[PDB]
Amino acid sequence: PHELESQFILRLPPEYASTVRRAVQSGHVNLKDRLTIELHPDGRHGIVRVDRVPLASKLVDLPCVMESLKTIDKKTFYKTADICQMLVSTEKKFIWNHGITLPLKNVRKRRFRKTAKKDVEKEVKRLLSTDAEAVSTRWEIIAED
Amino acid sequence: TASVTSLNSSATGRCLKIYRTFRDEEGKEYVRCETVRKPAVIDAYVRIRTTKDEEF
């Protein structure tokens, strides 16, 4: 079978980004030893090791949706993958508010309505499970108390 | 955060409180009173309860 490739964006500190960029544009396999990525079983934490120097990483969710588009003639472009995650290196914390491009900054707060909200469904399911595992349930919409 | 209108705990300004009766190991009959301070989850629970009542 075929499995869709999973592309994400890696953001590095600027000096380490310059060393990684020089090693990528050089093209030797020396870069392969120099740059490693260890993703922790949290799923939202990692180390990126540049030249064997550990950097602390967080895999965050991006507010917009990016799409990689490949081409052979620079006139027709074929969509290859969807990018929604970034492993910035240096829950609410794992959500990035800004977009990658310069015009998209504070996009989630200003150029996007917070329609993402309505977690709550999971809590409701847990409450239903507790009621099922119970015997008698008493409910009242309340006031200030 | 960009200034936005802040909604009240629902139109009614009413929270949801649930009392649960369960049996512990050996012999016991403890009762748990749990108050939902979130309208979203509370509204979803109320809708589910109404659907269950109709389902009869």
XYZ file of N, CA and C in Angstrom:
603
model
N 0.826 -1.213 0.000
C 0.000 0.000 0.000
C 0.864 1.268 0.000
N 0.225 2.440 -0.068
C 0.972 3.723 -0.022
C 0.536 4.495 1.222
N 1.490 5.040 1.976
C 1.139 5.860 3.159
C 1.500 7.317 2.867
N 0.559 8.234 3.080
C 0.806 9.660 2.753
C 1.995 10.132 3.588
N 2.935 10.846 2.964
C 4.154 11.283 3.692
C 3.765 12.364 4.691
N 4.497 12.457 5.801
C 4.129 13.428 6.817
C 5.237 14.462 6.912
N 5.000 15.634 6.347
C 5.959 16.722 6.363
C 5.608 17.710 7.462
N 6.624 18.201 8.162
C 6.444 19.271 9.127
C 7.572 20.267 8.951
N 7.487 21.391 9.655
C 8.484 22.448 9.540
C 9.354 22.414 10.790
N 10.668 22.544 10.629
C 11.587 22.611 11.762
C 12.141 24.022 11.866
N 11.904 24.673 12.999
C 12.426 26.003 13.266
C 13.547 25.901 14.288
N 14.696 26.465 13.957
C 15.905 26.385 14.749
C 16.309 27.773 15.226
N 17.144 27.861 16.258
C 17.733 29.147 16.605
C 18.606 29.649 15.472
N 18.770 30.980 15.337
C 19.299 31.538 14.070
C 20.731 31.158 13.730
N 21.615 31.065 14.728
C 22.974 30.595 14.464
C 22.984 29.117 14.096
N 22.223 28.302 14.827
C 22.088 26.892 14.493
C 21.358 26.696 13.175
N 20.427 27.595 12.844
C 19.782 27.542 11.538
C 20.763 27.849 10.424
N 21.720 28.747 10.673
C 22.711 29.051 9.648
C 23.665 27.886 9.432
N 24.069 27.209 10.514
C 24.935 26.038 10.358
C 24.213 24.890 9.660
N 22.949 24.644 10.016
C 22.168 23.599 9.360
C 21.911 23.948 7.895
N 21.707 25.231 7.582
C 21.472 25.633 6.198
C 22.720 25.453 5.344
N 23.879 25.826 5.886
C 25.145 25.625 5.188
C 25.430 24.142 4.966
N 25.121 23.305 5.957
C 25.352 21.878 5.799
C 24.348 21.228 4.847
N 23.132 21.765 4.745
C 22.158 21.219 3.805
C 22.543 21.591 2.381
N 22.873 22.862 2.155
C 23.265 23.312 0.821
C 24.614 22.765 0.386
N 25.448 22.311 1.321
C 26.662 21.607 0.930
C 26.333 20.259 0.301
N 25.580 19.423 1.010
C 25.010 18.227 0.425
C 25.677 16.917 0.783
N 26.750 16.949 1.580
C 27.438 15.702 2.004
C 26.592 14.944 3.030
N 26.973 13.700 3.337
C 26.249 12.897 4.367
C 26.824 13.267 5.732
N 27.786 14.195 5.764
C 28.351 14.684 7.049
C 27.200 15.304 7.842
N 26.271 15.977 7.155
C 25.094 16.595 7.823
C 24.298 15.507 8.542
N 24.220 14.307 7.962
C 23.362 13.252 8.560
C 23.830 12.966 9.986
N 25.139 12.827 10.200
C 25.684 12.609 11.567
C 25.432 13.850 12.429
N 25.610 15.044 11.860
C 25.505 16.304 12.649
C 24.082 16.577 13.137
N 23.057 16.310 12.322
C 21.702 16.692 12.693
C 20.878 15.457 13.033
N 20.414 15.364 14.285
C 19.520 14.285 14.695
C 18.278 14.869 15.352
N 17.217 14.060 15.423
C 15.930 14.465 15.986
C 15.407 13.328 16.852
N 15.217 13.630 18.144
C 14.650 12.631 19.087
C 13.299 13.153 19.570
N 12.220 12.432 19.279
C 10.873 12.822 19.675
C 10.446 12.002 20.884
N 10.058 12.688 21.950
C 9.764 12.051 23.221
C 8.375 11.418 23.193
N 8.108 10.429 24.058
C 6.784 9.780 24.054
C 5.644 10.646 24.569
N 5.908 11.875 25.020
C 4.843 12.861 25.171
C 4.157 13.120 23.839
N 4.935 13.186 22.763
C 4.434 13.526 21.460
C 4.556 14.988 21.116
N 4.714 15.853 22.114
C 4.866 17.284 21.898
C 6.163 17.813 22.499
N 7.192 16.979 22.592
C 8.457 17.408 23.164
C 9.577 16.670 22.458
N 10.717 17.334 22.315
C 11.812 16.661 21.635
C 13.147 17.304 21.929
N 14.185 16.683 21.382
C 15.502 17.287 21.250
C 15.842 17.306 19.773
N 16.293 18.446 19.275
C 17.019 18.474 18.017
C 18.484 18.703 18.340
N 19.345 17.809 17.853
C 20.784 17.908 18.199
C 21.541 18.413 16.973
N 22.001 19.665 17.008
C 22.775 20.242 15.872
C 24.256 20.163 16.241
N 25.058 19.442 15.452
C 26.501 19.260 15.766
C 26.640 18.659 17.169
N 25.748 17.736 17.529
C 25.801 17.056 18.854
C 25.541 18.053 19.988
N 24.905 19.192 19.695
C 24.530 20.144 20.782
C 23.014 20.040 20.973
N 22.511 19.582 22.142
C 21.076 19.388 22.346
C 20.276 20.697 22.413
N 19.112 20.748 21.761
C 18.228 21.944 21.809
C 16.840 21.450 22.211
N 16.069 22.238 22.971
C 14.797 21.729 23.465
C 13.681 22.081 22.498
N 12.830 21.115 22.195
C 11.883 21.277 21.114
C 10.464 21.033 21.578
N 9.544 21.691 20.880
C 8.118 21.506 21.109
C 7.436 21.403 19.760
N 6.603 20.384 19.583
C 5.828 20.240 18.364
C 4.493 20.953 18.542
N 4.299 22.036 17.798
C 3.165 22.922 17.977
C 2.265 22.835 16.749
N 1.012 23.240 16.940
C 0.001 23.244 15.894
C -0.085 24.626 15.274
N -0.087 24.678 14.013
C -0.071 25.935 13.284
C -1.494 26.397 12.983
N -1.747 27.715 12.990
C -3.137 28.182 12.898
C -3.726 28.058 11.505
N -2.925 28.256 10.474
C -3.334 28.080 9.095
C -2.965 26.673 8.645
N -3.316 26.349 7.409
C -2.957 25.075 6.803
C -2.045 25.352 5.619
N -0.857 24.755 5.634
C 0.033 24.889 4.492
C 0.004 23.620 3.663
N 0.393 23.766 2.400
C 0.392 22.598 1.496
C 1.651 22.653 0.644
N 2.423 21.563 0.613
C 3.600 21.513 -0.242
C 3.178 21.204 -1.663
N 3.733 21.948 -2.613
C 3.331 21.864 -4.006
C 4.582 21.700 -4.849
N 4.721 20.551 -5.494
C 5.885 20.284 -6.324
C 5.577 20.587 -7.780
N 6.631 20.812 -8.551
C 6.460 21.130 -9.960
C 7.659 20.631 -10.746
N 7.433 20.443 -12.038
C 8.490 20.048 -12.955
C 8.757 21.141 -13.987
N 7.758 21.948 -14.322
C 7.877 22.995 -15.326
C 7.642 24.397 -14.791
N 7.343 24.546 -13.497
C 6.993 25.805 -12.827
C 5.761 26.476 -13.417
N 4.867 25.718 -14.035
C 3.580 26.233 -14.475
C 2.403 25.468 -13.905
N 2.538 24.158 -13.707
C 1.525 23.333 -13.064
C 2.121 22.734 -11.802
N 1.382 22.823 -10.703
C 1.874 22.474 -9.379
C 0.983 21.396 -8.792
N 1.593 20.345 -8.259
C 0.867 19.199 -7.738
C 1.019 19.172 -6.228
N -0.100 19.056 -5.524
C -0.068 19.062 -4.070
C 0.490 17.747 -3.549
N 1.494 17.827 -2.682
C 2.156 16.629 -2.186
C 1.778 16.278 -0.757
N 1.589 17.267 0.114
C 1.242 16.999 1.504
C 0.632 18.244 2.124
N 0.027 18.044 3.294
C -0.504 19.103 4.138
C 0.383 19.248 5.364
N 0.809 20.474 5.641
C 1.634 20.799 6.793
C 0.785 21.566 7.786
N 0.786 21.097 9.029
C 0.079 21.759 10.109
C 0.879 21.809 11.395
N 2.123 21.341 11.407
C 2.871 21.224 12.639
C 4.303 21.709 12.459
N 4.827 22.248 13.548
C 6.157 22.827 13.532
C 6.915 22.414 14.777
N 8.166 21.981 14.593
C 9.011 21.549 15.738
C 9.930 22.707 16.122
N 9.379 23.739 16.763
C 10.184 24.926 17.174
C 11.217 24.449 18.190
N 12.451 24.944 18.077
C 13.536 24.517 18.990
C 14.221 25.749 19.582
N 14.762 25.622 20.795
C 15.476 26.752 21.444
C 16.491 26.192 22.445
N -2.421 20.881 24.037
C -2.708 21.866 25.114
C -2.578 23.286 24.562
N -2.816 24.293 25.404
C -2.716 25.714 24.975
C -1.271 26.008 24.559
N -0.295 25.474 25.303
C 1.138 25.720 25.003
C 1.523 25.134 23.641
N 0.857 24.058 23.212
C 1.235 23.370 21.949
C 0.472 23.977 20.772
N -0.223 25.094 20.997
C -0.909 25.800 19.873
C -0.123 27.071 19.547
N 0.274 27.243 18.285
C 1.023 28.455 17.850
C 0.028 29.489 17.340
N 0.107 30.736 17.801
C -0.873 31.746 17.413
C -0.525 32.385 16.075
N 0.761 32.529 15.770
C 1.194 33.222 14.572
C 1.343 32.261 13.399
N 1.319 32.817 12.194
C 1.565 32.033 10.999
C 2.998 32.198 10.544
N 3.430 31.404 9.560
C 4.843 31.392 9.187
C 5.223 32.662 8.436
N 4.374 33.107 7.512
C 4.693 34.300 6.746
C 4.570 35.563 7.594
N 5.262 36.603 7.134
C 5.181 37.918 7.772
C 3.790 38.553 7.837
N 2.918 38.506 6.804
C 1.596 39.140 6.964
C 0.712 38.441 7.965
N 0.930 37.154 8.165
C 0.153 36.354 9.096
C 0.886 36.346 10.428
N 0.514 37.271 11.305
C 1.041 37.352 12.653
C -0.141 37.682 13.543
N -0.301 36.923 14.631
C -1.502 37.079 15.491
C -2.731 36.733 14.636
N -2.594 35.772 13.714
C -3.716 35.365 12.815
C -4.827 34.759 13.658
N -4.470 33.885 14.597
C -5.511 33.177 15.381
C -6.334 34.213 16.145
N -5.664 35.172 16.780
C -6.363 36.241 17.536
C -7.106 37.237 16.639
N -6.496 37.723 15.551
C -7.139 38.821 14.776
C -7.761 38.394 13.444
N -7.043 37.645 12.605
C -7.578 37.331 11.252
C -8.392 36.036 11.256
N -8.605 35.479 12.450
C -9.390 34.230 12.594
C -10.345 34.382 13.772
N -11.611 34.049 13.572
C -12.581 33.982 14.697
C -12.330 32.682 15.471
N -12.397 32.744 16.805
C -12.158 31.558 17.673
C -13.352 30.600 17.583
N -13.608 30.054 16.389
C -14.733 29.102 16.174
C -14.263 27.668 16.450
N -12.967 27.491 16.732
C -12.401 26.149 17.009
C -13.063 25.563 18.261
N -13.260 26.391 19.290
C -13.896 25.934 20.556
C -15.341 25.513 20.264
N -15.780 24.398 20.859
C -17.161 23.879 20.659
C -17.472 23.824 19.159
N -12.400 17.966 23.892
C -12.135 18.235 25.331
C -13.466 18.259 26.094
N -14.329 19.230 25.779
C -15.656 19.361 26.455
C -16.481 18.106 26.156
N -16.436 17.629 24.908
C -17.193 16.413 24.505
C -16.668 15.217 25.303
N -15.343 15.125 25.461
C -14.713 14.012 26.221
C -15.183 14.077 27.679
N -15.236 15.286 28.247
C -15.683 15.474 29.654
C -17.142 15.021 29.777
N -17.971 15.372 28.788
C -19.415 14.986 28.795
C -19.509 13.457 28.747
N -18.677 12.820 27.917
C -18.679 11.336 27.793
C -18.291 10.726 29.143
N -17.288 11.306 29.809
C -16.829 10.801 31.130
C -17.974 10.927 32.143
N -18.691 12.055 32.117
C -19.827 12.274 33.052
C -20.907 11.221 32.781
N -21.181 10.949 31.500
C -22.214 9.948 31.128
C -21.781 8.578 31.662
N -20.493 8.251 31.522
C -19.959 6.949 32.000
C -20.122 6.854 33.521
N -19.818 7.939 34.242
C -19.949 7.931 35.724
C -21.422 7.724 36.095
N -22.335 8.388 35.378
C -23.789 8.245 35.664
C -24.210 6.792 35.424
N -23.710 6.183 34.345
C -24.038 4.779 34.007
C -23.527 3.852 35.115
N -22.320 4.123 35.625
C -21.703 3.288 36.691
C -22.316 3.633 38.055
N -23.328 4.508 38.081
C -23.957 4.892 39.346
C -25.262 4.134 39.566
N -26.050 4.600 40.543
C -27.380 3.981 40.822
C -28.440 5.083 40.722
N -28.284 6.161 41.501
C -29.270 7.274 41.503
C -28.590 8.586 41.096
N -29.185 9.325 40.154
C -28.606 10.620 39.700
C -29.587 11.764 39.989
N -29.123 12.824 40.664
C -29.983 13.998 40.972
C -29.393 15.237 40.288
N -30.209 15.985 39.537
C -29.685 17.152 38.777
C -30.540 18.403 38.991
N -29.913 19.579 39.093
C -30.691 20.848 39.112
C -29.856 21.954 38.452
N -30.428 22.732 37.527
C -29.683 23.914 36.988
C -29.611 24.840 38.198
N -28.448 25.432 38.493
C -28.414 26.143 39.772
C -28.362 27.669 39.636
N -28.248 28.359 40.763
C -27.966 29.792 40.769
C -26.656 30.037 41.515
N -26.417 31.282 41.917
C -25.198 31.633 42.646
C -25.135 30.945 44.013
N -24.097 30.141 44.222
C -23.923 29.401 45.466
C -22.472 28.962 45.656
N -4.996 39.420 24.740
C -5.819 38.789 23.670
C -6.725 39.865 23.060
N -7.068 39.733 21.776
C -7.871 40.786 21.116
C -9.175 40.935 21.905
N -9.578 42.175 22.198
C -10.774 42.374 23.058
C -12.002 41.774 22.376
N -12.768 40.968 23.110
C -14.009 40.344 22.557
C -15.091 40.414 23.638
N -16.364 40.386 23.239
C -17.465 40.370 24.239
C -17.353 39.070 25.043
N -17.480 39.157 26.370
C -17.381 37.947 27.225
C -18.790 37.453 27.557
N -19.129 36.241 27.122
C -20.489 35.689 27.366
C -20.645 35.308 28.838
N -21.862 35.425 29.377
C -22.132 35.000 30.777
C -22.226 33.475 30.814
N -22.146 32.868 32.004
C -22.327 31.396 32.120
C -23.695 31.018 31.545
N -23.905 31.220 30.233
C -25.195 30.947 29.546
C -26.164 32.124 29.685
N -27.262 32.100 28.928
C -28.280 33.144 28.970
C -28.883 33.242 30.372
N -29.096 32.077 30.983
C -29.691 31.975 32.311
C -28.689 32.254 33.434
N -27.389 32.285 33.120
C -26.385 32.449 34.193
C -26.521 31.324 35.202
N -26.737 30.094 34.721
C -26.980 28.950 35.647
C -25.950 27.842 35.434
N -25.275 27.406 36.507
C -24.316 26.267 36.418
C -25.069 24.937 36.569
N -24.390 23.811 36.344
C -25.044 22.473 36.430
C -24.401 21.665 37.567
N -25.212 21.098 38.470
C -24.662 20.247 39.562
C -25.282 18.844 39.505
N -24.455 17.798 39.591
C -24.953 16.394 39.466
C -24.657 15.608 40.751
N -25.652 14.887 41.283
C -25.427 14.022 42.471
C -25.351 12.568 42.002
N -24.293 11.846 42.382
C -24.109 10.448 41.905
C -24.073 9.478 43.092
N -24.853 8.395 43.024
C -24.889 7.387 44.120
C -24.198 6.107 43.645
N -23.198 5.625 44.391
C -22.432 4.419 43.973
C -22.184 3.506 45.180
N -21.870 2.233 44.924
C -21.574 1.280 46.028
C -20.074 0.973 46.057
N -19.423 1.189 47.204
C -17.966 0.923 47.355
C -17.724 -0.574 47.601
N -16.466 -1.028 47.535
C -16.119 -2.449 47.831
C -16.653 -2.839 49.212
N -16.824 -4.138 49.480
C -17.475 -4.567 50.754
C -18.887 -3.967 50.758
N -19.264 -3.227 51.808
C -20.580 -2.554 51.785
C -20.489 -1.071 52.082
N -20.890 -0.215 51.134
C -20.937 1.252 51.382
C -21.896 1.899 50.373
N -22.469 3.062 50.695
C -23.329 3.788 49.720
C -22.962 5.278 49.715
N -21.759 5.613 49.239
C -21.326 7.037 49.180
C -22.051 7.783 48.052
N -22.299 9.081 48.242
C -22.973 9.914 47.198
C -22.029 11.054 46.802
N -21.831 11.273 45.497
C -20.893 12.332 45.031
C -21.689 13.487 44.425
N -21.496 14.707 44.933
C -22.153 15.879 44.298
C -21.089 16.621 43.492
N -21.258 16.700 42.169
C -20.221 17.326 41.304
C -20.842 18.516 40.566
N -20.189 19.680 40.617
C -20.762 20.902 39.993
C -19.984 21.242 38.717
N -20.692 21.403 37.594
C -20.040 21.752 36.296
C -19.921 23.279 36.208
N -18.690 23.798 36.263
C -18.442 25.265 36.207
C -18.289 25.721 34.751
N -18.339 24.783 33.800
C -18.191 25.131 32.361
C -19.547 24.992 31.660
N -20.052 26.045 30.977
C -21.342 25.979 30.283
C -21.288 25.030 29.075
N -20.197 25.069 28.304
C -20.070 24.216 27.096
C -20.345 22.745 27.441
N -19.521 22.171 28.322
C -19.665 20.741 28.722
C -21.033 20.554 29.385
N -21.443 21.502 30.234
C -22.757 21.397 30.936
C -23.887 21.395 29.900
N -23.815 22.278 28.898
C -24.877 22.341 27.858
C -24.904 21.015 27.092
N -23.724 20.477 26.762
C -23.674 19.203 26.010
C -24.325 18.098 26.850
N -24.021 18.066 28.151
C -24.575 17.033 29.064
C -26.099 17.170 29.130
N -26.597 18.407 29.226
C -28.070 18.646 29.310
C -28.719 18.147 28.015
N -28.093 18.438 26.869
C -28.651 18.009 25.559
C -28.689 16.479 25.513
N -27.618 15.830 25.981
C -27.543 14.339 25.972
C -28.659 13.782 26.864
N -28.873 14.395 28.032
C -29.922 13.929 28.978
C -31.295 14.064 28.313
N -31.537 15.189 27.631
C -32.846 15.409 26.958
C -33.033 14.340 25.876
N -31.967 14.056 25.120
C -32.041 13.046 24.033
C -32.366 11.681 24.645
N -31.724 11.342 25.767
C -31.944 10.037 26.444
C -33.401 9.951 26.913
N -33.930 11.044 27.471
C -35.335 11.057 27.961
C -36.278 10.827 26.775
N -36.010 11.491 25.644
C -36.859 11.338 24.431
C -36.776 9.902 23.895
N -35.586 9.301 23.974
C -35.308 7.939 23.438
C -36.239 6.875 24.032
N -37.009 7.184 25.080
C -37.869 6.133 25.608
C -39.007 5.849 24.622
